[PDB]
């Protein structure tokens, strides 16, 4: 792991030492024990199951036990595969997978995961040493490949990709309220103002402009909300552009979907824009007395709902940081404090009140209406009455202007953000020659809510139109995979699944369309627009669908089929908030102010269901001309705590966005891919047809063999495409085979778990001179050891003794822990196994070997028949010219079909008196006996030594043999 050092103190939160990593990579783990079963709480938990029975799986919770069908079973991932940073490198990819990796990593302090182009981070909740000059350096030309998990590697390599490719680059950001979407996107931005490099109103150099838009922007854009407490309630598409090298040469920046709720109401814990709280911060007291506006918000009702002062908001600090950003992004001291006019006449618009004359509505005094007017510079006579009678001139209640001023308010916060972003864009941009650009998008990912309305539906149309253009990014680059691989896949595009809820959107005579339509009726309502949907939808688009009871609060008009899932969505004021009514003749004379501001952002003055598709498109149309990369934000709980993740909260991001939507489009092909060098060191025990030799044609023969499906896999080069559920079949089988030669190997362990008693009777005949020998003793395995004493019945041995040396049970032999699965002989026991053996000797004759070696009560019996021909009677064999020994040599053996069993070739070197050449070439074959499971080991050598010598007080002709023998040659 030294190549963790040069990331510091960084190196403990991008990934784990090989110490520590190891540790977790051989812990206690069982298959089809230890699995993922569906809870009833946090919807996915582990188990061990105890007894499975009658389709029916019985286990235990990570502590009760409950008994579920075994088609939700799920089997967990190897600790190989623990707080992996590639999931898409996992065996299993089904949701307890993918939740529980991020669950692990998020637990070890490590945030960033990649899941195959998704760059998944979840929120720290603490400050991490990762973000220092020294990490960044440490990222600059590294692929992301070549580096731990970080968002520095995604801006990086799509800086890089600029250069080298030549083309331009979006990184599209997305995630729920709270997932620290504007923390990474800010992160990027940054990185790219560190990168360099540098070209050629406002002041400071670019860098700072780009970085000091999102200070400024962030005061009237975003709020405390119950998920963040600086929580942007906009999207935003913020284009760098750079030169050919490339330099920074300009940028340009886009919002969306501005919420316009917040500044006229709030929720309970949540409270207003930022940037209300800040000026009544008494920071810079000039402002108050130009906005003629008291210290206490309460005394302003638009503000005064739900809390005030946030814990870590400074509001003081935070009115100066807003201040300095625009004075850096050129903005004229008239721009400045006319911002903060407009933002104080609406405080003073909600304290407005309105009473009846017996209706008209008459005000209810001037009060604090006039201070409103002075500040938007208008008349306060003919502003009250064109707020109570607008214009052919018409009358409205106390309920009508309350909702008017409500409105306007709205009207007059969204257009001046709106001027504000176009005036920052102004300084953004230069007459610095550009050439590439890299897109930076973040926009609230897809989201289920209790109530979902008309605002709903705008999101989950955006987020459904990125997602197909991820869905069909990811088909180009499988397709580019497969067909430079060998493999002839063919597919319809994935971002056609998502074409049909697309269609039901946007296409003529749409949900849409049919807003549109119904807009330009005034003789119209909710009940009208509800029932012309399900006159054109209701049983010809299959994605519209009947509202489901969701047996609470509250209900529906009719429901949406995303690739999310199924949203209920709440038709009423629909076709208020689509055109969205205005006081026509309070925007008159808005036009008519002294207050240059407030008439520029008034002028000319359809629908925002259109807009928002002018806005959608040309964003898509920049998209498509770029080099997508995704980033994926995930926040770990409510309660804003780091180190813990709620399942059910975390599964509902993950089935939202693209993450679990990517994956379910891969397993459409040939998802698991290994190469053909780790499938045959992996996958050989199941059937040893690789031989001790292709790994491309061994990759084959291999699977071809087995009893399997040879559709669900297809040949690349080089490496070896595999089915989804195909894999997860290969290690069922390998563990399978694993346990039944563990159980085999202990039983042939334990007839050889000591000292065993040995009885050998011989019976040969060699150039028609018969003998016959009889031998006994014991042999311990464990130890190596092997003590006999051969006595010969019939007299003198016509032959020398140490030529019956290896015709006198290598089922003594000493196996060690690491080669005891390839110990034969004990594995023939107590069946036992017949040995045959054919002695060659140099200018001599031969031997006839037959030995049955087998158990016989508590003693272990070699019963063996010998016959030689030829000879000589004046040779070295039948004329006593060898000395008394054996000395050392090693046995090949080989295991080879059929009828199991082994094969050896050996050569045995005796020695003669002068001279000591003699070659005994032996060629041995082993069978076991009476059938049944025995092993068969691979290609290993035993290491023999044999020592010779006599009992002087044996008056027959005999030889004490103590030899030792030890197994050797794998690891």
Not at 46 to 71: C, F, H, L, M, P
Not at 495 to 514: N, R, T, V, Y
């Amino acid at each position: 792991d030294s190549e963790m050092a040069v990331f510091g103190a960084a190196a403990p939160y991008l990934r784990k030492s090989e110490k520590e990593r190891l540790e977790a990579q051989t812990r206690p783990f069982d298959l089809k024990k230890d699995v993922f079963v569906p809870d009833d709480k946090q919807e996915f938990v582990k188990a061990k199951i105890v007894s499975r029975e009658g389709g029916k799986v019985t286990a235990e919770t990570e502590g009760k036990t409950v008994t579920v069908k075994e088609d939700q079973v799920m089997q967990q991932n190897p600790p190989k595969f623990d707080k992996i940073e590639d999931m898409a490198m996992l065996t299993f990819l089904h949701e307890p997978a993918v939740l529980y990796n991020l669950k692990d990593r998020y637990g070890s302090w490590m945030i960033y995961t990649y899941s195959g182009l998704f760059c998944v981070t979840v929120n720290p909740y603490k400050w991490l040493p990762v973000y220092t000059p020294e990490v960044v350096a440490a990222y600059r030309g590294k692929k992301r490949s070549e580096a731990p998990p970080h968002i520095f590697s995604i801006s990086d390599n799509a800086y890089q990709y600029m250069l080298t490719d030549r083309e331009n680059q979006s990184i599209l950001i997305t995630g729920e309220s709270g997932a620290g979407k504007t923390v990474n996107t800010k992160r990027v931005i940054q990185y790219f103002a560190v990168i360099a490099a540098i070209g050629d109103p406002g002041k400071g150099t670019l860098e700072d402009q780009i970085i000091q838009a999102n200070p400024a922007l962030e005061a009237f854009g975003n709020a405390k909300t119950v998920r963040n407490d600086n929580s942007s309630r906009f999207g935003k598409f913020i284009r760098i552009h750079f030169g050919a090298t490339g330099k920074l040469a300009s940028a340009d920046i886009e919002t969306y979907l501005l919420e316009k709720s917040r500044v006229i109401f709030q929720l309970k814990a949540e409270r207003d824009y930022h940037i209300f709280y800040q000026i009544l911060s008494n920071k810079k007291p000039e402002l108050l007395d130009m906005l003629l506006i008291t210290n206490n918000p309460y005394d302003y009702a638009f503000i005064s709902q739900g809390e005030t002062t946030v814990a870590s908001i400074d509001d003081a600090e935070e009115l100066m940081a807003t201040d300095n950003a625009f004075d850096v992004l050129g903005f004229t001291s008239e721009e400045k404090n006319s911002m903060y006019k407009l933002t104080g006449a609406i405080m003073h618009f909600g304290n407005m009140k309105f009473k009846l004359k017996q209706e008209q509505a008459e005000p209810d005094g001037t009060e604090e209406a006039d201070k409103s007017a002075y500040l938007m510079g208008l008349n306060s006579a003919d502003l009250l009455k064109g707020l109570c009678h607008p214009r052919v001139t018409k009358g409205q209640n106390v309920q009508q202007v309350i909702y008017a001023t409500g409105a306007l308010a709205k009207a007059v916060y969204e257009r001046m953000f709106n001027w504000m972003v176009t005036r920052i864009n102004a300084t953004l941009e230069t007459k610095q020659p550009r050439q590439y650009f890299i897109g930076v998008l973040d926009i609230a990912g897809f989201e289920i809510f209790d109530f979902n309305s008309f605002e709903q539906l705008c999101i989950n149309f955006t987020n459904e139109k990125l997602q197909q253009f991820f869905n069909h990014h990811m088909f180009v680059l499988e397709q580019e995979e497969y067909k430079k691989e060998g493999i002839e896949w063919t597919f319809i595009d994935f971002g056609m699944d998502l074409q049909a809820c697309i269609d039901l959107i946007e296409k003529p005579m749409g949900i849409m369309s049919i807003l549109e339509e119904e807009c330009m009726f005034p003789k119209a309502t909710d009940m009208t627009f509800k029932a012309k949907l399900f006159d054109n939808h209701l049983g010809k688009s299959a994605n519209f669908q009947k509202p489901r009871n969701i047996k609470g609060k509250p209900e529906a008009h009719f429901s949406l089929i995303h690739y999310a899932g199924i949203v209920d969505y709440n038709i009423i004021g629909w076709l208020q908030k689509n055109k969205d009514p205005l006081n026509e003749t309070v925007v008159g004379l808005y036009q008519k102010s002294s207050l240059k501001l407030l008439s520029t952002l008034f002028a000319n003055y359809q629908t925002v269901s259109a807009l928002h598709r002018e806005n959608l498109n040309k964003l898509m149309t920049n998209l498509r001309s770029t080099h997508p990369h995704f980033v994926r934000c995930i926040i770990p709980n409510e309660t804003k705590s780091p180190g813990v993740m709620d399942n059910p909260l975390v599964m509902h991001q993950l089935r939202c966005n693209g993450v679990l939507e990517g994956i379910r489009i891969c397993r459409k092909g040939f998802p698991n891919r290994i190469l053909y060098g780790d499938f045959r060191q992996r996958y050989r025990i199941l059937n040893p047809a690789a031989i001790p030799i292709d790994s491309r044609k061994g990759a084959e023969k291999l699977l071809s063999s087995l009893d399997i499906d040879h559709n669900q896999y297809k040949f690349g080069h080089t490496k070896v495409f595999f089915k989804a559920g195909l894999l997860g079949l290969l290690e069922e089988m390998r563990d399978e085979r694993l346990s039944r030669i563990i159980t085999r190997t202990q039983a042939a362990e334990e007839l050889f778990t000591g000292v065993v008693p040995i009885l050998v009777e011989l019976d040969g005949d060699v150039n028609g001179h018969k003998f016959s020998v009889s031998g006994e003793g014991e042999g311990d395995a464990t130890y190596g050891k092997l003590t006999l004493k051969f006595i010969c019945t019939t007299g003198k041995l016509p032959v020398p003794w140490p030529t019956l040396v290896t015709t006198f049970v290598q089922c003594f032999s000493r196996y060690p822990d690491h080669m005891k699965r390839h110990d034969f002989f004990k594995s023939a026991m107590p069946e036992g196994y017949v040995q045959e053996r054919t002695i060659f000797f140099n200018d001599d004759g031969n031997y006839k070997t037959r030995a049955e070696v087998k158990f016989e009560g508590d003693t272990l019996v070699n019963r063996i028949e010998l016959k030689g021909i030829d000879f000589k009677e004046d040779g070295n064999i039948l004329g006593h010219k060898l000395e008394y020994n054996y000395n050392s040599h090693n046995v090949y053996i080989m295991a080879d079909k059929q009828k199991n069993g082994i094969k050896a070739n050996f050569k045995t070197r005796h020695n003669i008196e002068d001279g000591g050449v003699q070659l005994a070439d032996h060629y041995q074959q082993n069978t076991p006996i009476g059938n049944g499971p025995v092993l068969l080991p691979d290609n290993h050598y035993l290491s023999t030594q044999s020592a010779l010598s006599k009992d002087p007080n044996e008056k027959r002709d005999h030889m004490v043999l103590l030899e030792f023998v030890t197994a050797a040659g794998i690891t």
